[PDB]
Amino acid sequence: NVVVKYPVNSELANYAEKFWKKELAIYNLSLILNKMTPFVKRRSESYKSSLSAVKEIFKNVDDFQNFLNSVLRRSLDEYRVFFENYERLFNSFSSKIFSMRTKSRLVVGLGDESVYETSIRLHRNYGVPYIPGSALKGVAKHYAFSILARENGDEILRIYESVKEDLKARIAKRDKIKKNDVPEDYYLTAAVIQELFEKKFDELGAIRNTRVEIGDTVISVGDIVKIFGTQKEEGSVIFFDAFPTPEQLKDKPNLELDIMNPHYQPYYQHGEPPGDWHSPNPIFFLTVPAGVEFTFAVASRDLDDLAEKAEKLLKEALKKFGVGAKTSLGYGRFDA
Amino acid sequence: MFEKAVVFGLYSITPVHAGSGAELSVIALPIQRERHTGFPVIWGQSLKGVLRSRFRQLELDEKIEVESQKWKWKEKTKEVLKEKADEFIKKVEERKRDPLLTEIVFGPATDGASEHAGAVSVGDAKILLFPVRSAKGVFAFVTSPIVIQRLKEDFELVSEIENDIELKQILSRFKVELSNNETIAGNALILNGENKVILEDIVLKVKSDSNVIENLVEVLKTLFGDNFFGKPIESIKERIAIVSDDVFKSFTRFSTEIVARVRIDAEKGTVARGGLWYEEFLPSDTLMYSLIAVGSPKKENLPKEVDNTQKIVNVLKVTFNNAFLQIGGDETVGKGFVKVRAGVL
Amino acid sequence: MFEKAVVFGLYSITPVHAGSAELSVIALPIQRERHTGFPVIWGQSLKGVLRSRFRQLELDEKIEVESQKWKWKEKTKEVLKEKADEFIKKVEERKRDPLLTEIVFGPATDEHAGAVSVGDAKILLFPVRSAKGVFAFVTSPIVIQRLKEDFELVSEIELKQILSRFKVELSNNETIAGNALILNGENKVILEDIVLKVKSDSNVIENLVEVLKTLFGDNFFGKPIESIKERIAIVSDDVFKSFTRFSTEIVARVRIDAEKGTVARGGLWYEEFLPSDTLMYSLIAVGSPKKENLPKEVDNTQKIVNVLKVTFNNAFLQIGGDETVGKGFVKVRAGV
Amino acid sequence: IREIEQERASFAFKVVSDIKDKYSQNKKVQGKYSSYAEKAPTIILNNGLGATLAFFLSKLEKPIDDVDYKSINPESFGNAENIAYAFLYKHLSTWLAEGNGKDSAFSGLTNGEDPLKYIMEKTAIDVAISTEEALSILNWIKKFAKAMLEEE
């Protein structure tokens, strides 16, 4: 009762429809997802090319998830050799490697622009979910920022009154008028700490003697800035991408669906009173389920002690801060 | 002029961003490419720079194995330049001058260039196989007639340098010509029950030919041994496709990785004002071949272990075989890591 | 003087950066003309590289003349004697050159004159990016006119007579090109963000490839000349000048210090490189050899031009700077 | 010597000035148009040009395979998102199918056919060149939109 169309060129739409009808066997998940996106028309006169409308061509959500995971599993041998080479690359450097399972659902790259409006970070060649190293480095840096703000908030605020005044003036300039309201909350401390770590690293020389307790170890501010680097000095810790272990993909699914059902969406966007006359607009998106095991590795360029400190910081961040998208809802959390 | 030539093969384990810095298209920070063709290449300057940095690190760490014997640069410099051995060492201690072996091979450091020229000359990392997604055979290694023609020209140059005509005709038995909708693909990529292939956006009729693909596989095997960067070479002979020139150009221009990155400000937890940018990356599992020519060293009073050109050839081959290097930017976030294999004819 | 002349082809395997003079953008602009602005190699640099190659070959003793090896060590004593052995010491002292180079490619630093004068390398085919037919060899009518005027002095037999038929006139927005470059359906072709209408003609490209394969062989520098015919375009004079001025390879280079891992201050500069797969032609004018008791093998001018063509045919040699980074290697095919 | 860059810049300036003048009051329309313009190249590089055009048409609540750019009015939509999507689709398709004009240096790769219907039954090389041209014109349009149009 649904009409499927394909905006790809002719002589290829037939093969795309064969792939989506399971008549043929596709092997690359990113290929079928992106380059062969179907446009589904329901009783409503509109070819909505969204996962909510894309799933309508299957029997149910379970069938869609099973099809996606079978397509993912069809490249298991290639992913296995790729992971073996990746582990060899890890061991080539003096990299410390640790494995972590997903405590809750994880979704990285949800904000990427795509036809589905809700994308997911999939490896181009093999079509498996992965965490880019940039995300890990950023989450570690932000966890360090949060720890510093929570512990040494008033101290750094007093030491850098000029910087906090500059930040308050900037906020007043952009955030409405707010001439001097500018509450000195934890968020302002985090902002000025980030500003110090990004544009005012040299002025952070005095603070470098400070130490903050992470997990069981103690990390200095100088250690953190050496690990991450500045505009004038390169970081010393190499953060590699994280990939799931190939073994677990054989038995449990590595990709599932999740739903967002925004009732009162006009209230949030347009300003209508919430009430209850606000029929929802469900939107589905892919996410790797909880329990999937990922392998992380951090290497060093100058000192292995910095690598160990960065590994501890990243473990703490993944345990508490969380990586990926919708981290405010407990998504993308890892457990030992 | 030159004496010998080795072939360096680079297999991109992670996406590689050899930055160019020339303007900014919609995909910001474009990679360096050949202007007239658009094919992605790594210029000799960057490859020589990273090789020189790795060699300097190895020599300072005292890990370079010459003739299966460890190389200590201090005692060698003393045996060569005993009059000023201390002073030159101070320059290395102050980073003014690079260590002895790197200065012999890659030339003297920037602080002084008129003394001698480099004994080595790297080449541009011309692409050989491109990873393109496929319906069957999850991803495929793709090549173009210009690619194999340039490989044959490179082989001819190697034969001329070494005066070895025997290796000249290794690839000289491969002439091809393909329409824009035809390809010579391995059995894995070919669709079941249909003599057609799909390379990430296109349905291509499978042209029937075996000598060309067999010769290409044999050439790769001769260049890089029987181990093709962690997997046997014979295991990928059925995942190779030779496509039309325009199709290969389109693959190299549009199938490259486009990575979006943002900066998260702690004041709000959202992307900052203009904190987002896109970067172009070479896809993972790509092959780039380069020529490294070597002649007589231009220095004076050389040690006996590096006296002749072959003593440099073997040292470079043993020190840069199945190694891992970082090319381009985003080193700190695990980008640009490549497996390097050195071969000779 | 200069009784005979020969034509030398030059195909750029790798980008060539010869010499260095406005330098408006590129800190090291390529070796360029003045009246026309076309890329060019000064006769001095080409003569220098050719004479260096000849000197190295003489040292290596691979200059077989008339299918017989040329041993210079015996020849110098045969033609000079007395101090010739002592003259050998001058070669050993590097203060002089072997007698063949001294009598052909000019004297030493310190009476006589070179038997051959090396002319300028004029451009013949410029590779430009095409929307279809990935890259195209483009020329200009005055390029063909210069080729004909240069080539009237060597070939003349019937090839010179038939070469006179090349005479075309092109507007600033029109071109003649092969089937590969012309877009499907629309009768226009796009090169380097310039759209040109195809002019109906089937004679100029045929004659150009005819003469090219006539005095350069069917094997067009390791490639079949027939395939080249389909990707030959001729554009207007202003269009060709703009192409040769703005379609060269502008490459930005930097220097990184290992102390901090960033670019050294003031270490960024742009260098301009002549594109690869560029056909260039040079004229070598050979006169009567200097009367210094020359051997009867190369007594006449015909013999010396023959030996030069034999020893330089299908050769490989590096021109310009940046030799250490794989720039400047070209292939020379003497015109027989 | 009429570079297509001049035609690209002129067309982008004309279209961005047109949307700025027609909807100077609707700041949210300007913001939506700017966001869609600076996000479109990512969609084109990800899912292709035809998929992007079909996505715009779907966001316009219009059927595919039976709609061309000449038969859509960008101002005939109540919603700001629909307004911006229609304007972007019209501008991109107009540049692809006609260029800056018949008498201009660039006359569009497609003669006069609808770019989506053109993509449906053309070779991969033609759609690749069309994608390249769309990328360039979208880059210019995003540049000019960031220049003048207000930011959401």
Q: A231 to chain C nearest CA, in Å?
A: 8
Q: Which two tokens stand for residue D86?
A: 């229609």
Q: Is the separation of the CB atoms in C52 and C294 below 8 Å? A: no
Do C316 and B53 lie within an 8 Å CB cutoff? no
Backbone angles phi, psi at A122, to 5 degrees: -115, 140
Residue C173: which of D2, D126, D129 has the nearest Cβ? Answer: D2
Helix, strand, coil proportions of chain A in percent (round to 5)? Answer: 45, 15, 40
Interface probe, candidates D47, D59, D117, D118, chain A, greatest A C-beta count within 10 A: D47
Tokens 């972590």, located at residue = A100
Substitution target from B36, B43, B91 for chain C, most C beta carbons within 10 A: B36
How many Cβ atoms from other residues are within 10 Å of residue B165's Cβ?
A: 10
Residue with tokens 């005027």: C149
Please classify residue C13 by burial: count the beta carbons closer than 10 Å to its beta carbon, then call 0-12 exposed, 13-18 middle and 19+ buried. Answer: buried
Cα B285 to chain center, whole Å? 12
A14: enclosing H helix or E strand: helix A13-20
Angle, CA D66 vertex, CA D60 and CA D67 arms, to 5°: 45
> Read out DSSP for C285-336?
EE-PPP-S---GGG-SHHHHHHHHHHHHTTEEEE-SS-GGGT--EEEEEE--
Which tokens in the block code for residue C172? 């600033």
CA D27 – CA A246 distance, rounded (Å): 50
Distances (CA, A) of C327 to B307, C19, C27, C31: 26, 13, 17, 14
Largest CA distance in chain A: 70
Closest CA to A196 of A173, A172, A164: A164
Nearest to C3 by CA among C281, C289, C215: C289
Q: Helix, strand or coil for residue A109?
A: coil
Query: Nearest residue on chain C to D2, judged by CA atoms?
Result: C194
Assigned token pair, C278? 């560029």
Three-class SS state of C163: helix
| Tokens standing for residue B221 | 């095997």
Residue of C261, C38, C214 lying closest to C140 (CA atoms): C38
Q: How far apart are CA B51 and CA A219, in angstroms?
A: 34
Where do runs of H (alpha helix) occur along chain B? 44-60, 73-80, 85-93, 100-105, 145-162, 211-224, 245-254, 309-319
Give the closest-approach CA distance of D102 to chain B in angstroms: 27
Q: CA–CA separation, C178 vs C158, rounded Å?
A: 26
Distance of CA A215 to the CA centre of its chain: 23
Rounded to the nearest angstrom, the minimum Cα separation between B48 and chain C is 7
Distances (CA, A) of C272 to B172, C277, C320, C327: 33, 16, 12, 12
Distance, CA of D49 to CA of D115 (rounded, Å) = 9
Experimental method: cryo-EM
Give every CB contact of residue B198 below 8 A, 6+ residues apart in sequence. A12, A15, A31, B134, B135, B136, B191, B204
- Separation of alpha carbons B337 and B12, rounded Å: 6
In chain A, residues with a C-beta closer than 8 Å to the C-beta of C262 are 232-234
SS3 state at C137: strand
Helix, strand counts (H, E) of chain C: 10, 16
Helix axes A133-159, A161-174, angle to 10 degrees: 110
Burial of residue B239 (CB within 10 Å: 0-12, 13-18, 19+) is buried
Helix, coil or strand: residue C228: helix
CB contact under 8 A, B266 and A112: no
Q: Between the CA atoms of A266, A270, A275 and A280, what dihedral angle is there, to the nearest 10 degrees? A: 0
Does residue D41 contact residue B27 with C-beta atoms inside 8 Å?
yes
CA distance C52 to C312: 13
Say if residues C10 and C323 touch (Cβ distance below 8 Å).
Answer: no
Q: Contact, B105 vs B119, CB < 8 A?
A: yes
Sheet of A47-48, strands arranged across: A3-5, A39-41, A47-48
Residue C326 sits at the chain B interface (C-beta within 8 Å):
yes
Q: Are A130 and A123 in contact (CB under 8 A)?
A: yes
Q: For residue C70, report the phi and psi dihedrals to the nearest 5 degrees.
A: -105, 105
Bridge partners, C223 (sequence order): C220
Between CA B167 and CA B152 the distance in angstroms is 10
- Cross-chain Cβ contact B250/D124 below 8 Å: yes
Q: Give how far Cα C61 sits from Cα of C67, C301, C306, Å.
A: 13, 22, 18
The answer to whether the CB atoms of D123 and B180 lie below 8 A apart is: yes
Separation of alpha carbons A55 and A62, rounded Å:
10
Q: Strand C174-177 and strand C194-198: pairing?
A: parallel
Which positions in chain A touch B284 (Cβ < 8 Å)?
123-125
D-chain CB neighbours of A3 within 8 Å are none
A128 CB within 8 Å of a chain B CB: no
Q: H or E segment at B291?
A: strand B287-294
Answer whether A55's CB lies under 8 Å from A283's CB: no
Residue with tokens 């006449």: C300
Cβ-nearest to D131 among B27, B202, B254 = B254
Residue A207: DSSP 8-state: G
- Which residue is associated with the tokens 């070598």? C284
**Which H or E run includes A131?**
none
**Nearest CA among A255, A254, A274 for reference residue A264:** A274
Spatial separation of the C-alpha atoms in residues A200 and A191, rounded to whole Å: 12
Contacts of residue A147, defined as CB under 8 A and 6 or more positions apart, other chains included, come to A212, A214
User: In this structure, are strands C315-318 and C329-334 parallel, antiparallel, or unpaired?
Assistant: antiparallel
Burial of residue C109, with CB atoms counted within 10 A of its CB: 0-12 exposed, 13-18 middle, 19 or more buried? exposed
Q: For D7-73, give the secondary structure using H, E and C.
A: HHHHHHHHHHHHHHHHCCCCHHHHHHHHHHHHHHHHHHHHHCHHHHHHHHHHHCCCCCCCCCHHHCC
Judging contacts by C-beta atoms under 8 Å, the chain D residues touching residue C185 are 111
Q: Is A83 an 8 Å CB contact of chain B?
A: no
User: What is the full DSSP assignment across C3-58?
Assistant: -EEEEEEEEESS-B-------SS-SB--SB-SSS--BEE-HHHHHHHHHHHHHHHH
d(Cα B185, Cα B157) in Å, to the nearest integer? 29
A233, A238, A302: which to substitute to probe chain C, counting the most C Cβ within 10 Å? A233
Whether the CB of B334 is below 8 Å from some CB of chain A: the reply is yes
Tokens at A125, concatenated: 């060649």
- Using DSSP's 3-state secondary structure scheme, residue A18 falls into helix
Chain A residue with minimum CA distance to C264: A232
User: Cβ contact (<8 Å) for B250 and D48?
Assistant: no
- Asked if A4 and A38 count as a contact pair (C-beta separation under 8 A), the reply is yes
Following DSSP, what letter does each residue of A136-180 receive, concatenated? HHHHHHHHHHHHHHHHHHHHHHHHTHHHHHHHHHHHHHHSSS-SS
Which of D35, D38, D125, D144 to mutate: most B Cβ within 10 Å?
A: D125
CB A100 within 8 A of CB A336: yes
Among candidates D1, D106, D111 on the partner chain, residue whose Cβ is nearest the Cβ of C172 = D1
Give the chain D residue whose CA is nearest to the CA of A117: D43
Exposed/middle/buried for A300, CB within 10 Å: 0-12, 13-18, 19+? buried
Q: Looking at the DSSP assignment, which residues form a beta bridge with residue B139?
A: B133
- Nearest residue of chain B to residue A228 (CA atoms): B332
The pair of structure tokens assigned to D117 is 């219907």
Of B324, B257, B14, B286, the residue nearest B139 (C-alpha):
B286
Breaks in chain C, after residue numbers (C to N greater than 2.5 Å) = 20, 110, 156
Cα C201 to the center of its chain, rounded Å? 29
Helix, strand, coil percent content, chain B, rounded in steps of 5: 30, 25, 45
DSSP label of C256 = B
**For the packed helices D80-98 and D27-47, what is the interaxial angle rounded to 10 degrees?**
50
Burial B170-202 (b: 16+ CB within 10 A, else e): bbeebebebebbbbbbbebbbbeeeebbbbbbb
Q: What is the DSSP letter of D1?
A: -
Residues of C in contact with B152 (CB under 8 A): 222
Q: Give A31's DSSP letter.
A: I
Cβ neighbours for B209, distance < 8 A, ≥ 6 positions apart? B176, B184
- Cβ contact C261–A233 (<8 Å): yes
> Residue A185 is inside which H or E element, if any?
none
* Residue B170: both structure tokens together: 């290794």
DSSP string, A181-242: -----HHHHHHHHHHHHHT-TGGGGGGGG-EEEETTEEEEHHHHHHHHB-SSSB-SEEEPPB
Dist. CA B19–CA A285, nearest whole Å? 34
A16: Cβ contacts below 8 Å, ≥ 6 apart: A6, A8, A32, A36, A38
Domains of chain D by start residue, with CATH: 1-149 (1.10.520.30)
* Closest alpha carbon within chain C to A233: C260
What residues of chain B lie within 8 A of the CB of D138, using their CB? 26
Q: What is the DSSP letter of C196?
A: E
The answer for B165, left when phi > 0, alpha when psi is -120 to 50, beta otherwise, is alpha
Here the tokens at position C241 are 């000048």
Q: Which of A105, A310, A321 is nearest to A227 (CA)?
A: A310
CA C229 to chain centre: 20
Which residue is associated with the tokens 């501010």?
A221
Breaks in chain A, after residue numbers (C to N greater than 2.5 Å): none
Most D CBs within 10 A among B25, B26, B247, hence the mutation to make, goes to B26
Tokens representing residue B156 in the block: 């001819």
Question: Cβ contact (<8 Å) for B198 and A15?
Answer: yes
Please return the burial class of A244, using the count of CB atoms within 10 Å of its CB with bins 0-12, 13-18 and 19+: buried
Q: What is the dihedral of CA C317, C318, C320, C325, to 10 degrees?
A: 170
Residues B196 and C215: their CA atoms lie apart, in Å, by 43
User: What's the N-to-C CA distance of chain C in angstroms?
Assistant: 22
Task: Please name which of B184, D64, B203 lies closest in space to residue A15, comparing C-alpha atoms.
Answer: B203
Cross-chain residue pair D46–A9, CB shorter than 8 Å: no
Burial of residue B218 (CB within 10 Å: 0-12, 13-18, 19+) is middle
Q: Please tell me the number of Cα atoms within 13 Å of B254 on its side-chain side.
A: 31
Neighbours of A212 (CB within 10 A): 18
Type of residue numbered C3: E
Mutate to test the interface with A, among D45, D52, D55 (most CBs of A within 10 A): D55
Residues of C in contact with B22 (CB under 8 A): 250, 252
Beta carbons within 10 angstroms of residue D62's beta carbon:
18
- Taking a C-beta distance cutoff of 8 angstroms, is the pair A54, A38 a contact? yes
The CA distance from B332 to A271, in Å, is: 44
Cross-chain residue pair D53–A7, CB shorter than 8 Å: yes
Is residue B264 a contact partner of residue B271, using CB atoms and an 8 Å limit? Answer: yes
Cβ contact D3–C184 (<8 Å): no
Integer-rounded Cα Rg, in Å, for chain A is 24
Q: Report phi then psi at B94, rounded to 5.
A: -95, 10
**Of B134, B334, B339, Cβ closest to residue A238:** B334
CA angle D118, D120, D123 (to 5 degrees): 80
Strand partners for A307: none
Residue B278 has a CB neighbour count (10 Å cut-off) of: 18
Determine whether D34 is exposed, middle or buried from the number of CB atoms within 10 Å of its CB (0-12, 13-18, 19+). buried
CB contact under 8 Å between B266 and A187, yes or no, is yes
3-state secondary structure of B39: coil
Smallest Cα–Cα separation from A207: which of A191, A224, A190?
Answer: A224
Q: Which residues of D touch B26 (CB under 8 A)?
A: 41, 45, 135-136, 138-139, 142
Rounded to an integer, what distance in angstroms lies between the CA atom of residue D116 and that of residue D114? 6
Token pair for residue A102?
Answer: 């997903």
d(CA B71, CA B312): 13
Residue D1 buriedness (CB in 10 A; 0-12 / 13-18 / 19+) = exposed
D41 touches chain B (CB under 8 A): yes
Burial D75-102 (b: 16+ CB within 10 A, else e): eebeebbbbbbbbbbbbbbbbbbbbbee
Q: Using an 8 Å Cβ cutoff, are C244 and C123 in contact? A: yes
Between β-strands B139-143 and B126-133, what pairing exists: parallel, antiparallel or unpaired? antiparallel
C260 touches chain A (CB under 8 A): yes
**Nearest CB neighbour to C259, from listed B32, B95, B291:** B95
- Under DSSP, the state recorded for A327 is G
Out of B26, B254, B258, the one facing D139 most closely (by C-beta) is: B26
DSSP, collapsed to helix, strand or coil, labels residue A254 as coil
Burial C63-90 (b: 16+ CB within 10 A, else e): bebeeeebebeebbeeebeeebeebbee
- Four-point Cα dihedral A127, A128, A133, A138, nearest 10: 110
B67: left (phi over 0), alpha (psi -120 to 50) or beta: left
Q: CB–CB of B203 and A12 under 8 A?
A: yes
Instruction: Using a CB–CB cutoff of 8 Å, tell me whether C184 touches chain B.
Output: no
Task: Report in angstroms the alpha-carbon separations of D49 from A15, A216, C140, D134.
Answer: 19, 53, 36, 8
User: Is the torsion defined by CA of B57, B62, B63, B66 positive or negative?
Assistant: positive
